Symmetry: C2
Subunit: 379 residues, 2 copies
């Protein structure tokens, strides 16, 4: 029996999961936090802690049938898109992308360097969150700005949550018992970050995030779509700097910017007690999502299935209902008995007579990455 250790290395925290790719069982899962007065000063002590934690649940990596270490990287730019076996020269090369993702890419490189020292007798593979969308058609990838300037600095729509969108699309096909290559579909990843995609066969046609993960849907702490003139306008009126504006749009916007709350489950309570700011944030969220659904129906022309996924998507009945209500003339009919809170697994939530099928499909990024590692190392 064989296993893959999957790592997600951010700036103040580190996530890990040890998983068997054939059965899908997770032997051990955990997170190291707060990497100021902390027992974990740097990234070296952090990986050492994860080891102690694995030992504590009865795991030993010499006995566990370890065959690979998989590392998550947010941005592969225009040059890294397939799963990639790591060496010295590939790693040096990866440093050139920090321009595109300065908060997220450098701590992943830290995680790679440490893992390679402490575990030199095992192959290490990088997997890129941008990779599924590398082949977007040019009509959808190209922004309408100065050509020469765009090509020089590699500006285009990159897209994110690629591992999740590809996994759900495959599982939706299996649930329906139909070949994936003959399907057209829409996927909605609703978590702390939010994005939508439109997919034909095995190839994506469009997606809601852009150059960076800021664009598109309304999120927990990010604005999504906004006129790029806000930057200039805030400079000339408020005397705000460019770095200040960008930071406000990433960490002090979305639901928290409108209502003061990040935690989506608190928002329902505050609405029932008559808080006006909370009701406005929920309806701004809902309005943006309805637009992306209609826009992708037109892009596709004919749509077989629509699927909800991630933390909010798999669990929030009110959200799914408010996303597609009043759309029967477009082909969507929801069934209230089936859309009930508290259900489990892949399931149908639309009426039997709905022209377009609607599903909940749970996501499993770590399991998809483990299967990617084994494939690249020769089956």
């Amino acid at each position: 029996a064989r296993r893959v250790l999957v790592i997600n290395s951010g700036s103040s925290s580190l996530k890990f999961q040890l998983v068997d790719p054939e059965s899908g069982v997770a032997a051990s899962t955990g997170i190291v936090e707060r990497i100021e007065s902390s027992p974990v000063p740097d990234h070296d002590a952090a990986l050492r802690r994860a080891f102690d934690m694995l030992a504590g649940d009865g795991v030993d990596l010499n006995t566990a049938g370890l065959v690979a270490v998989g590392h998550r990287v947010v941005h592969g730019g225009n040059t890294f898109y397939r799963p990639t076996v790591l060496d010295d020269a590939v790693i040096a090369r990866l440093h050139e992308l920090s321009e595109l993702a300065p908060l997220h890419n450098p701590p992943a490189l830290l995680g790679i360097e440490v893992a390679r020292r402490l575990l030199p007798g095992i192959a290490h593979v990088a997997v890129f969150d941008t990779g599924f969308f590398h082949d977007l058609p040019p009509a959808a990838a190209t922004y309408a700005i100065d050509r020469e300037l765009a090509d020089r600095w590699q500006i285009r729509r990159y897209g994110f949550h690629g591992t999740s969108h590809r996994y759900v699309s495959e599982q939706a096909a299996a649930f329906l018992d139909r070949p994936l290559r003959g399907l057209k579909q829409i996927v909605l990843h609703l978590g702390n970050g939010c994005s939508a995609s439109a997919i034909a066969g095995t190839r994506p046609l469009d997606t809601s995030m852009g150059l960076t993960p800021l664009e598109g849907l309304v999120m927990g702490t990010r604005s999504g779509d906004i006129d790029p003139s806000v930057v200039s306008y805030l400079c000339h009126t408020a005397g705000m700097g460019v770095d200040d504006v960008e930071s406000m749009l990433n960490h002090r916007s979305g639901v928290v910017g409108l209502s003061g709350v990040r935690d989506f489950r608190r928002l329902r309570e505050l609405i029932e007690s008559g808080d006006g700011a909370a009701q406005l944030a929920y309806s701004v969220f809902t309005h943006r999502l309805r637009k992306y659904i209609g826009a992708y129906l037109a892009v596709l022309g004919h749509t077989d299935v629509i699927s909800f996924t991630a933390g909010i998507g798999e669990n929030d009945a009110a959200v799914r209902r408010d996303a597609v209500s009043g759309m029967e003339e477009l082909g969507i009919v929801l069934d209230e008995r089936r859309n009930l809170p508290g259900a489990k697994g892949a399931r149908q939530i639309s009426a039997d007579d709905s022209p377009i099928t609607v599903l909940v499909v749970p996501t499993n990024e770590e399991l998809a990455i483990a299967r990617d590692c084994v494939r690249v190392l020769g089956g």
Copy 2:
């Protein structure tokens, strides 16, 4: 017969028209160009308007016997302050000056047009009409961006929308073409010209629109980018060393169709495509994909939709653009008819098949007439 003089006062040029609001008949039309140039006999805005009186005299208008009753002035941005057609006086003009950070390039020359005209025609009433007015009322879920609330409130940041005069007027003509009251109709309007925008409308109330805080947001345009990740500004500061103000200017003046292909006129674009140019085909396909998305989005906002209308310079004339925008949409209720879509006819006309669940029209826009009828109405009779 009574008549109104309608004025559009830009930085380098001034447009005008003398029109009868009851008959729709335009007695004189024209433009004064190259204002401020060393070569030019027109050094400032005072001389330009005087030039315009002479052309009217040339065209046969005896100004003292023409039955003139108002001057209509168009202004791009009214903020949250001015949204109805407004009788001008010196107090109103002072309040307008304070709004110029919302429109640094377009608002100032329109104020100059007002001040010159009040001095030369002091015994006629003057009226301002705001391109933002129709959208002042958007529902809060469509008007509000998802950013820091205290911040948005202090600096008056919201979706304002533009092409207001055109969207309203076309929505009224569509209802009239069909023999139906406006209050019972849900409709989409597509204004495709040098600038481009879309709206979603329920009776007399707009539900959404594609331009935003400024005219930069939404569809792909002649020289403007439309939608793009706001992170471009940040990214270009750090890597190409560009200043905020130069990015803004690039996004407004060197993007769009021109940025991708080198070309302006859409009639030139077609010839380049049919001759096989690769960059031209790409520019046009990016333009088309963005437009298809806005049509789908607003079908979902409305829920049920009665009619879709094309208008302005491209919408009224270009039959390939219409076909590319709505083909392949039969499962959404749209069926186009090839024979009615052909170039040649002018005037309001149907282009969908007789049995299409959703009706599709071409409806010509007449912004000068709409503005003249507003002047007469606010002046009490």
